[PDB]
Assembly symmetry: C12
Homo-oligomer: 69 residues x 12
Amino acid sequence: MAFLGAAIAAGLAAVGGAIGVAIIVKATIEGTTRQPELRGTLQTLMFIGVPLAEAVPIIAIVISLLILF
Amino acid sequence: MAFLGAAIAAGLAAVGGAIGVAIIVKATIEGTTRQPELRGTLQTLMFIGVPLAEAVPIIAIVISLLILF
Amino acid sequence: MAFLGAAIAAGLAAVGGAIGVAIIVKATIEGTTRQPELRGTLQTLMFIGVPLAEAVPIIAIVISLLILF
Amino acid sequence: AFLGAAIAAGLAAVGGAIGVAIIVKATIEGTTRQPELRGTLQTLMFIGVPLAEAVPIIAIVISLLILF
Amino acid sequence: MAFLGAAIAAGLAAVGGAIGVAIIVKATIEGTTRQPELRGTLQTLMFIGVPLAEAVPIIAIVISLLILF
Amino acid sequence: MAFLGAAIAAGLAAVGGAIGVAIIVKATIEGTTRQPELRGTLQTLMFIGVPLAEAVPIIAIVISLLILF
Amino acid sequence: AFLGAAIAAGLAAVGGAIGVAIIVKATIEGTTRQPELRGTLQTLMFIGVPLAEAVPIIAIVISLLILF
Amino acid sequence: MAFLGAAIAAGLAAVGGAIGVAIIVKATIEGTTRQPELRGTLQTLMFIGVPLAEAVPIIAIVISLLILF
Amino acid sequence: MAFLGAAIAAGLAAVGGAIGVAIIVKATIEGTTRQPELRGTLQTLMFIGVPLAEAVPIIAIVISLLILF
Amino acid sequence: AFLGAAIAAGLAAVGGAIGVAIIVKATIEGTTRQPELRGTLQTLMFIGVPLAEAVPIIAIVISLLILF
Amino acid sequence: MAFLGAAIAAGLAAVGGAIGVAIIVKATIEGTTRQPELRGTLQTLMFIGVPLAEAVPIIAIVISLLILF
Amino acid sequence: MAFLGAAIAAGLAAVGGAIGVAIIVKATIEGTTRQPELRGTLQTLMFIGVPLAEAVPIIAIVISLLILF
């Protein structure tokens, strides 16, 4: 259960963080696509969304690593 | 029973918190791309929604850390 | 398994409360985007919807904390 | 079962949250397009929310009794 | 066990009845949005769908309450 | 598991009958909004679909109620 | 166990419900985006529904079989 | 568990076979709604598509009925 | 569990083979209706796509029937 | 152990099925909105189909392998 | 345990690697249509995405093969 | 069940890393197709997005590989 837990904590959190950042990057591509003038404002805007999207999965990995010893 | 429980609770909070934040910032990028004129007023508005978005996932992470241990 | 219970109850309340608020604020961000004159009316409208959005998750998390004693 | 009480409340959580979230999202979508009459949709949203919340919360009610 | 059953029976009826009515009222909002005089006919029209929408969940919840007893 | 059986059979029938009928009235609301002359034909057209939409869930509810007795 | 027969009807429930539901949803969309031809598509919906319902109901037959 | 097996095999084939053919008729009406001239050409095309769609679910219920003997 | 295995393997492959092929014909119906001149090329085109689409579910179905004996 | 081989091939089934289903759907919808380059579009799926099937099909090999 | 494990590891990698390239090939079909003069630039773009899309599923197939010993 | 754990953790990360990268390159193809003038700006943009998207699945596999040693 402890072995399974560390697996489940990181594994299901992967899909969160993976598609999480993926959904944001797709948006930034759609942003640059419909206006190429704004590569700079959305880049910073995407570089903001990525950490917070990634934020909770890594903490689920810390919990994962704790359960892993 | 017992580490395993804490794992999914943080893991399920990851998927919640990741896509949760992913959905608002994607929208905020969509706000800026079609109107870059008012990037700042909506910027603060996204920074209001993000905590609230993370609010319930984050509380699910506290209980996760609480049960372990 | 009370810990296991508390885990899924909080985890499931996370996904509810996260995407729940995520959808309204995304709407309000999209709302301010196609009319910024009424940024305040939708802000208030979102500050009304959010408690209602949180209503079941917040009562679902106390049961999570209660089942754990 | 302690586990049981969790899922009844847990499924009502996802239900009641996104359930109410989608109607208010709609009212926000409503206010964006021709909001001359802001008041009529307010009442419409305040009607939909209780019935939407109605079944999850009573499903939450059954959750707490099987628990404590 | 019997309590466990009642949980899934009411729980699936919870998500059912919640999103079920939610999608109907959402539709009614889109209806009222493009016609404000037309608020009266759709009001009654939603009041038709809601009972039928609630019909099976409530009966699924009625059996649910029996399942724990 | 007689309780559990009745639970899963009714619970699974709950989500079916709920969202099934929910989209039909939504369609009728979406139908009436883009033409109010034909509000009557869509009502009866939905009044055909609603029984059929609920037909299989209720018999799944009947078997649900049957295994509990 | 007999537990299966419950989910089998339940799984056929969600199947059979949304199956006809998306079909009827479409039929309303059909008459709205052309109102004169409500009749020719009407039978077409009365054609689609049985075959759509066909597989869920035969899954219900085994469900009743797994029970009795 | 052969009874249990026979149940899910047909049950999963049920949701499959139902939604499979269901999506086919929606397409056929979608053709007729804004092209009513060739109702015969699309009818045969759907009456060809329906068997193949039902083919694997119907074969899955055969296995369902077979393991139950 | 051999009955269960054969059940889920064929049952979940049912959803695969049903909706998988169903989406292919749905496109051809929507395609042929919004241009009826090329009805013949689309006939062979689905008769090409369908085998490959069913190819992987059906070979998974062979595995389904052997494990049950 | 029999149960395992079932899901491995089964999950590879839904993977490989819907995977090519989305691409072939794309190629016909592509051909519908330009019929001159039907030949260029034929090859792309005959490229896409193997790679789409590649990982599901190797998952069925392991499926029979885990069964020995 | 190990046979069961290896099964889901490849199975989950199956849906990933299959649908992964599927979304990429789907994108290229819409891309190649307008225009095919730039088919070569887009072909290379797809031949980049395909490995990376398959990257995590294929290593998960190695773990499936890894569990074999 | 340690063997089981390593399987799902890498397996669940597979769907994450696959669909995660898949949606990004699909988006980038949609960007370049509507104007290839800026092939280079999006080239770097996907080469930025892909690592962060791939980031958590890969750390989920190291965690997966860690339970396996």
